[model samples]
Target: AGDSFMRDLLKREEELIGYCREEALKEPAAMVEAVTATVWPQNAETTVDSLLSQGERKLKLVEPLRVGDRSVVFLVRDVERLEDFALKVFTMSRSELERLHEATFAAARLLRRLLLPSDAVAVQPPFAQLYAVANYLLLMPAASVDLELLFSTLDFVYVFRGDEGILALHILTAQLIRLAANLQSKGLVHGHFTPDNLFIMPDGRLMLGDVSALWKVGTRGPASSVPVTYAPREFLTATFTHALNAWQLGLSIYRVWCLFLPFGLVTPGIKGSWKRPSLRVPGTDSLAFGSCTPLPDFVKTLIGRFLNFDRRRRLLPLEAMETPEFLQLQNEISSS
Candidate 1:
């Protein structure tokens, strides 16, 4: 929202550009694909005029995955060799192409790391991959499932209820924290972390996806998608750090509990303004021994700890995972 603020405060335009270039090197093909290829699929030999006459600007829609403001993700049987795979294609303006190229590759690299053959928590079997970092197309494994759908379909409305689904989510969150810890241990930070970026396989295992925002410690980059609910106060100051990720996880937990996003109603860039859900359904903030509350005291405390307006006071990723509540939740979920 505050592009000027971002440019001024970060004080590292050149550094951000360097980060973009570095990410570009990771998936040069995707960058090339973005510019030349449709990134989507083409139909059976349709006439040029007919093809050009499609409505809503037909840009090859694969088995649609998820749609966002900047891009469209599709699920396909294969992405590279087989011409059957999922694709996340986003349109970019001439001015934004460089930024999108960087963001997309960053995400691609993260997805690749999570899907690494040796990674214990790999989401899917290797398939095919495609992206453009330069004027070429890069190919790798194309995952099948979308984790966001899997997470959302569960009992997110009453996550604290300790129901089977909620318990399962708790376990998933722990696994996520473990994954995040692994990333952090490597001196990396996933600038963006939220439900939409995760994928779940048919076997119920989770895979971390949408890793385009990965950054090194103190690394500054161009502005991309930012989720306000998952954003910590320090985010407003244009500082990206692992602590911010911990806060996002806490907010995500709250969303799972309430089955709604906390800041969905708040306008972007409006300071000190937020709206609570109109109706507090059963088990929200209700502390009745056996009840699941909206934002349980335990959860509230966790959220409060991470969502501090003061960045210095926020919990680090490792510290957040070590919290008794987090461990207790992990145990509860895993045992279930």
Candidate 2:
């Protein structure tokens, strides 16, 4: 009996894999839905068609962008309107979902104000416009790729070569700074500003694609899977603020500018200890640049300000933009 049962289980697993592969080839989005339903049978009742119809909108899934622990992102299209959108489906308890829904709507309202002009429905430098429908959030103009993929897959040496590289870096940094300032104006914090969450556009624009980690000022939540190096010490306590975003932004720029990973020289999981505990600063973790292409003094100074351990000492987005070096970089980019 045991031998028969084991054989049956193995057969079922094989069948599942075969089915998934076949469906994946036909329609990857359908495969995602099928696999998700099989993995978590409880979600089987909720189908993509059901969710689409719930919004009273004619939309259909095109492909699956990504599937995470709690959510699945799908590239969706409006059947009648012929528009593309990114649909994020969240799988969670009713209570958790409700809370997120509330938070998401609130954040969206704030973002709309910051991103859009007072009288305009939509403005330039396109921001992620979010719409909630039956536990799913639809974002328009789906991003092509995230920064992590860009950095990992492409050769850094080739991408950042010559004056062209410097110009690209300056533009990226300026755009992010402008975004940060806008968020700060509305007392919103992008708790997770990691490269993985940022999307890159074909026109060299960066947009905040995922707003799952956003929080209003003074709000706090349980810690999620944030990178230790990108995150500050306050992350350990689940304390988040705009300054945290600044620190993360700075670190990202440093990595791009220096063409090296943060603390690339040091072994992973071992942050050097200080001789005196009293002299030890809480969030003042040291980063090693190692051997990298020398950056301009202005760029180095700007990065140093952003990476300052003390939240008070860290330069805010607006402050950074106002700096002479930053102004110079912006001017150069505009002219060239």
Candidate 3:
């Protein structure tokens, strides 16, 4: 992977980010979570073959959703039948490319299996599941809201505040683990786990939105550049491994909780990071870990394990769900 290429790729993304944030501010969270799929048909078997005939005539480009090194994602629609979807058009590759396509499509398939009949998808899926056409392209459910859009709204402040706060955080933790666990079970590492790569469904479940940067657990890939806020110290020189996903997972949880990243900030755009991460505010929670408000003891315990400096010691997602803290939420969630 070309680090410089992605840096430029991220530049275009940053430009797009500015667009969504500006538009998102005036739009309430209600706009996304308010209504979900109702009139649209429920079909898990949707594939590019059925929708696209190797022809571009049927598609209507709504807008650009994500810009990546390998592929550019779009919010497209069916001009004939009229359905919005995410189209991942790859720039082009061969063996690794084959696996990239295979793994990405597999992600949707595995998620379909992971889903229960009783879950929110029982009515309408979080969004349509991912399915690819030629490994060069993919057609997935188009979600209006992602973690970034969620953070931009006022709901970012309200939900985690009152009596609802505890349950809210617990539910978030459970979904985060479950999503990661699904990918891990298949030996897939979502190399990019930042807020932009995940989505928020009307049902409140967070689903993975991008798999362009995926890697296998036992393998390593070329050095890649990641966002400043999400990078771990190991990202620079160390072997890229499953541990990176764990670091980002903890990061997502931390950001959502504190409304910021672990490194905090150092001159606005610049900041320092731990080789691994430690979940806490700057000084208050460092001396002792018993008093943090938004971050509970269990979260600290999990983050401690997930963000361990040694990749050898990092907590895997499959292992994360079995923790007492995770189970505590699991048990509570199951009852209701």
Candidate 4:
């Protein structure tokens, strides 16, 4: 362990998660219910911007953030507003961009009403409805980096062996579950739940960046295009559904705790018994029995349920969150 360095890193992790929870609260909701204590607050903030279409505006590129097959994201400054924002430019043909632009907003409008619990009660999803302002460009809040980069820099073997490190990951894991459950509670898949697609804002907000890939359960369309490491067999086949997201999420958590994708770049074939995260018994601020132990069994079981190759048997995102493990995990995180 890096001793003092370890303490500092744990402190930063604690601050970032709490700051993220604060970011969700900043968006004042349209109406307040008795459930304000909920961590994932889906309010009216995004609703106000629903009508504000992306206008034809000048942008000065600051730097490249991420480059991908279909899109390039850059840190850019708004010429008129003089504010920095991330601009995602589509690399697709103009005709295809227009098709996507139209389809995105159309989906957003419906998502606003349908993402809420039940099929009818309308409420905005926790994610932003990422409609392109122009045929080729999307404006988003400038962010620091995705989890992919963050995890890459950390010494996972050391971090995951410590209680503070486990606690930090648990906090983030809980927040993501709560957020996904709030908007996608009924049935909706994020399509891509990999760390590269999950962004950490400058203010510590954890956001799922792509709305274009969102898939409604029972809807027929192309399968998700996430990489093999993040994709489930269902996505590989035609049996895609909300369960697809659960598989992606399970693997994502696996990477967080275990520190690397299971089986490296290869698929986790049957009897995939990867080593669980090891924790230091003499914890960060406290200690008990001073020996390493496995990560909580509840989380382990959910991971099994989530990554089931049988799509029909795999837990959907909301269903996974509802299991008793989620409740126990939430309580553990709260007391931490």
| Top TM-score model | 2
lDDT for residue 244 in candidate 4, whole number 0-100: 67
lDDT of 4 by residue, 1-336 (tens): 122333455446654543433333334221112122121135311111222332334556554555444555556565667787765544324466556556666665665212111101011231222212222345667656566655643432243436766776776676556555654675666666777777655544566766666677666765546565566544543544666677677776665555455433332211223332221112122111112235587877766776676777877667767789988987887676
RMSD of each: 15.0, 13.8, 12.4, 14.2
Q: Model 1, range 176-283, lDDT digits (tens) per residue?
A: 666666766777766666766654433344455545466676677543445654554445425567776766665555544543444433322222223532222222
Q: Per-residue lDDT of 1-336 in model 3, one digit per residue for the tens?
A: 122322333343444444655454334333222111211224322223322233332455555555444445556666666877666554333566556555655554444312211101111111232212123445667654566554443222333455445555566666777778887887777566777677654334566754545556655665464555466656653455667888778767765555444543211111222332222223222222331345767777787787676777889888988889888767765564
Q: After the best TM-score superposition of candidate 2, give how far the Cα of residue 284 lies from its true spot, in angstroms.
A: 11
Q: What is the C-alpha lDDT of each candidate?
A: 0.44, 0.54, 0.52, 0.52
Cα lDDT tens digits, model 2, 92-156, are 44566556555555555655212111111111111222112133443445555555444442332
The alpha-carbon lDDT assigned to residue 177 of candidate 2 equals 72
Residue pairs with backbone atoms closer than 3 Å in model 4 (clashes): 30-44
* Global CA lDDT computed for model 3: 0.52
Whole-model alpha-carbon lDDT for candidate 4: 0.52
Q: Where does candidate 3 stray beyond 4 Å?
A: 1-20, 24-52, 61-74, 87-138, 154-161, 265-293
**TM-scores for every candidate against the unseen true structure:** 0.58, 0.67, 0.60, 0.64
Candidate 1 weakest ten by summed lDDT: 118-127
Q: What ranges in model 2 sit over 4 Å off? A: 1-55, 112-139, 155-157, 202-204, 223-227, 258-260, 264-285, 291-294
